Structure 1
């Protein structure tokens, strides 16, 4: 039996990460975890849909099929992003002058 795996490098499927959902690599390395299920939303007019709504079939993507013995690799480079400010301020906006 095979297993299918693929990465959406062109950002065509809806991005459901970054919504504070459950199911990332447990904090303790010894814990065995469960792969969450995928799903997405689209435009809706009430409980129904509209013609502008989209349907995505994930079998319609080039994917790699791998058996026991094969493995999958992936590499990625982040783009330029500002440093996160891991510090507090020793001064204040309203008190930024000479006290003398």
Structure 2
């Protein structure tokens, strides 16, 4: 229900190296607009309006999430070309205009 900024590939991701320390980036979002000024349909989301969990030192936060079915990525290349799928040793039985 809040503008989702993760799709665009931007900075503020965890480091690749485990010893590094991760500075958490600030959250901001864009809304519908005409140039810099706001169109009538632009929205303002206050993230305080959302229920949160306040956490002290002893406290800790957790949640689990399960991906919806997505297709496997193809980690393979192809041995064959799309146009070369044919048997090289034979001829077609299909006539065509020449």
TM class by smaller structure: 0.7 to 0.9
- Residue 79 of structure 1: how far off its partner (Å): 0.5
- 1:64 matched to 2:53? The reply is yes
**Structure 1 stretches of 5 or more lacking a match?**
1-11
Name the larger-Rg structure.
2
TM-score (norm 1): 0.86
**Structure 1 runs, 4 residues or longer, greater than 2 Å off:** none
- 1:27 matched to 2:16? The reply is yes
| Residue correspondence of structure 1 range 1-100 to structure 2 within 5 A | 12-100=1-89
Kindly indicate whether structure 1 or structure 2 has the higher relative contact order, using CA contacts under 8 Å at least 6 residues apart. Answer: 1
**Structure 2 stretches of 5 or more lacking a match?**
90-98
TM-score (norm 2): 0.88
Q: Once superposed, what is the RMSD of the aligned Cα atoms?
A: 0.7
